């Protein structure tokens, strides 16, 4: 059929993920093996993916591939990236951006000018094309725009943001103040995880503000989804937010003597991962950068010292140790060094703090609390102070980015993580992946709307809904809700929560599974893949009840103005849910544009495409499932003139009419019998997957036959001539 002699396929390969192979013999039904040439016998009764014909390969948009599957996407991105040094490729509306780990001279004035005023499609894929389309639709639709730059940190999201902004600035010192804030935002929002040395654990939305004449007047940073849990807990080989290590490595600087910092292994809140140092990073040098950037963004030196006082206070706070006392109560040891320092730095009374760290109000008795409750409260306090510090810093960065000129419109650049899947997934990953389900719903709905519109335009008559996954996560009796419920039960644990999950969801929701050999983990079928979460730590990470009296003590401080400036059970998961709902309202009130940044290798190698890494990245960013959805419809879309031009050689002289469109229609209906395989639009033929590939095969077969006939004749002629020469005695 399609698996004929000559036909090429992709087969699994450990190193390259997939490897090409040609059918060394024709596949017949009933065959258990394919005869392939990498020669080899490939044991099947699912046949391997077909390789696209050469004419479709290396094109600017992946959705023009006829066999639209993972190896075709991998191969196409690879050849563009390696053979043509093209880092940008479209995937329908999605711009895929592969980090070249090389400064490319493709962002200059001359190039900005060539993209300005052009349509989306007439120019080669580029971040500028996306930035232009956003600028263009902003004015045309009188509608705010969002450029959603997804992927892991270091895949090239900051470059994409930089040049979207550089572009808007040109075609219309905003870009440089925004970039100057990067070291600030990375110090307070990024952390070293097991898989990434500098990972943003929050979503950052930079609204580029435009006046009435679409000139850039300034910017506004909004932040979402901050990973609060990290402030007080790190897993193995992970760090807290960078700023804490910047501060600890700066402990001997004279101006910080009063902060009384030890090294990063001194503090409970920075030592848990056993990774004080990131290779290649000088946290003391990054502190210098951070302070310079703080100065560059208008944060006075007193306020900087206040930021650091507060962080130092969080760190000493975390060292406060509770003694268990009679009747499940607790107390703070006399003259406890961590607390004395904390109270000194914050300027609050030692006894008033020590009292409220071990007691709560119940109204009106003064109840002692247990050690576990005191720890949870102390952590919640640390997280609360951090989150409010973080918001303060952001508010004040914003004072520097805001313009006096009134704002008519904006294009917001969202820097957001893609799906995150480690070997061991916990609450942090669950939240990230939840965020990704919500973002994916917006994308899917967007694309489906663009598709309806395209089909309407062409006069042609399937939606993959992820609402069920979202509901499993966020609806009442869902994973997060059950987690909240388990957290407010005094005997609650991870193990009982696990069982509540199984009781509620196992065999009731096909998106939820339980591992065979564990009752302490669950599996969610997310958009891109199944992810297994370990239940351990979910409860404690979720707890976030801040005690009002502890806050009142901080609110009463008379040593520095910054601390009071910062200020049903509250949970991290619910706060994440609320933040994510806030992010989606912000994005849903705009028209989204999508850039997926992928890291092509793990070693910062210039133009180096590791297939295993690339396949993982493409999946995490949603691309492979987006392709699979596109491959289910009519992904191939050719104008009648393109079809006429390419497939003329397939036509008999008889049916070549003056009406070139009608010719295409008559010829196609004889070449491909099943009329369900394509749809005739006004200007374009829409084809199912595989159809264009099939046309290329018969075309290729026609040319191959003609050629062999000619070349065997030529070979005859040449040999008869040689023979005459050798006969004559030459």
């Amino acid at each position: 059929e399609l698996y004929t002699k000559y036909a090429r396929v992709w087969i699994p390969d450990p190193e390259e993920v997939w490897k090409s192979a040609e059918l060394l013999k024709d596949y017949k039904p009933g065959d258990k093996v394919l005869q392939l040439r990498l020669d080899l016998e490939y044991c099947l009764k699912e046949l391997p993916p077909l390789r696209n014909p050469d004419i479709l390969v290396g094109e600017n948009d992946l959705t023009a591939l006829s066999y639209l599957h993972e190896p075709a996407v991998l191969h196409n991105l690879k050849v563009r990236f390696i053979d043509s040094k093209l880092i940008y490729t479209y995937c329908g509306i999605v711009l895929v951006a592969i980090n070249p780990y090389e400064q490319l001279p493709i962002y200059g004035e001359d190039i900005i000018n060539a993209y300005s005023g052009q349509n989306m499609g007439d120019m080669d894929p580029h971040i500028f094309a996306v930035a232009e389309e956003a600028y263009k639709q902003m004015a045309r639709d009188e509608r705010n725009q969002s450029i959603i730059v997804s992927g892991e940190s270091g895949a090239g999201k900051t470059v994409s943001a930089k040049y979207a902004m550089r572009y808007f600035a040109t075609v219309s010192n905003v870009e440089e103040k925004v970039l100057a804030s990067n070291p600030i935002m990375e110090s307070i929002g990024n952390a070293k995880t097991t898989r990434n040395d500098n990972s943003s654990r929050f979503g950052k939305y930079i609204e580029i503000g435009f006046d009435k004449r679409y000139r850039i007047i300034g910017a506004n940073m909004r932040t979402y989804l901050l990973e609060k849990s990290r402030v007080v807990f790190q897993a193995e080989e992970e760090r807290n937010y960078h700023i804490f290590y910047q501060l600890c490595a700066s402990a001997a600087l004279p101006e910080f003597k009063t902060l009384r910092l030890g090294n990063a292994n001194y503090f409970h809140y920075t030592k848990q991962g056993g990774s004080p140092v990131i290779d290649g990073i000088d946290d003391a040098k990054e502190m210098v950068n951070t302070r310079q950037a703080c100065t560059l963004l208008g944060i006075s030196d007193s306020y900087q010292m206040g930021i650091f006082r507060i962080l130092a206070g969080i760190l000493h706070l975390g060292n406060v140790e509770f003694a268990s006392r009679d009747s499940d109560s607790c107390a703070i040891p006399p003259k406890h060094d961590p607390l004395t320092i904390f109270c000194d730095l914050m300027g609050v009374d030692y006894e008033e703090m020590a009292h409220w760290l071990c007691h709560r109000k119940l109204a009106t008795y003064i109840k002692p609390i247990s050690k576990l409750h005191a720890i949870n409260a102390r952590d919640a306090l640390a997280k609360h102070i951090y989150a409010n510090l973080f918001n303060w810093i952001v508010d004040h960065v914003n004072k520097a980015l805001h313009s006096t000129v009134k704002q008519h419109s904006f294009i917001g650049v969202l820097d957001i993580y893609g799906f995150e899947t480690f070997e061991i997934n916990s609450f942090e990953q669950f939240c990230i992946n939840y965020a990704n389900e919500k973002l994916q719903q917006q994308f899917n709905m967007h694309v489906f709307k663009l598709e309806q519109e395209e089909y309407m335009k062409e006069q042609i008559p399937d939606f993959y809904d992820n609402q069920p996954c979202i509901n499993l996560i966020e609806a009442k009796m869902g994973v997060l809700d059950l987690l909240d419920e388990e957290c407010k039960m005094p005997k609650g644990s991870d193990d009982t929560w696990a069982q509540k999950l199984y009781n509620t969801h196992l065999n009731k929701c096909a998106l939820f599974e339980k591992p065979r050999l564990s009752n302490k983990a669950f599996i969610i079928k997310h958009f891109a893949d199944k992810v297994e979460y370990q239940c351990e730590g979910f409860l404690e990470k979720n707890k976030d009840t801040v005690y009002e009296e502890q806050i009142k003590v901080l609110k009463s401080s008379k040593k520095f103005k910054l601390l009071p400036e910062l200020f049903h059970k509250k949970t991290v998961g619910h706060q994440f849910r609320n933040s994510l709902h806030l992010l989606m309202e912000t994005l849903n009130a705009t028209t989204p544009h999508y850039v997926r940044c992928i890291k092509p290798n793990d070693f910062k190698f210039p133009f180096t495409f590791d297939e295993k890494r690339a396949v993982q990245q493409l999946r995490a960013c949603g691309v492979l499932e987006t392709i699979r959805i596109s491959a289910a419809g009519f992904p191939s879309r050719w104008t009648y003139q393109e079809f006429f031009s390419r497939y003329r050689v397939l036509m008999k002289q008889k049916d070549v009419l003056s009406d070139r469109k009608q010719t295409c229609k008559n010829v196609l209906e004889k070449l491909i019998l099943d009329k369900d395989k394509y749809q005739f639009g006004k200007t374009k033929i829409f084809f199912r997957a595989g159809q264009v590939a099939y046309l290329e095969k018969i075309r290729a077969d026609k040319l191959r036959a003609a050629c062999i006939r000619i070349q065997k004749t030529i070979r005859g002629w040449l040999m008869r001539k040689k023979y005459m020469r050798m006969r004559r005695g030459d």
């Binding site: 040319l703 003609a706 006939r709 004749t713 070979r715 005859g716 002629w717």
Partner: protein, 139 residues
């Protein structure tokens, strides 16, 4: 084949013997068939040879008697024209396009093989009258 034909084919076969043992290489078998008026594809030649491996193709030697059944097996216009009309409708074919297709599709030929046969048949625009070119290589 009668005795006279066999004598004529044998004389031709003997011209291809570059070692003096009355034999040719497997790899020469195709050339001798073509020299005797046949136009087998390379695939057809390899089939009558028994689809040999690289090693026996380069070093196995056959006398006339073993060659003969292969020649026999191989031995036992409107399509040719249409075949050229694939690459055309003014009765021409670019020399550049024909060169490309003959060296990159099918049983690919060397550029030198293609240059030899194409010499003198293309005009100043770089076009070959293929009906004329076809008669020539069929002559």
């Amino acid at each position: 084949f009668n005795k006279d034909q066999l004598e004529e084919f044998k004389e031709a076969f003997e011209l291809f013997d570059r070692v003096g043992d009355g034999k040719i290489l497997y790899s020469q078998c195709g050339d001798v068939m073509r020299a005797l008026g046949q136009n087998p594809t390379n695939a057809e030649v390899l089939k009558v040879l028994g689809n040999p491996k690289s090693d026996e193709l380069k070093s196995r030697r056959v006398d006339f008697e073993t060659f003969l059944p292969m020649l026999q097996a191989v031995a036992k216009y409107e399509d040719y024209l249409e075949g050229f009309r694939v690459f055309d409708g003014n009765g021409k074919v670019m020399g550049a396009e024909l060169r490309h297709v003959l060296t990159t599709l099918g049983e690919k030929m060397t550029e030198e093989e293609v240059e030899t046969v194409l010499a003198g048949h293309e005009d100043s625009n770089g076009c070959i009258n293929y009906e004329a070119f076809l008669k020539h290589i069929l002559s």
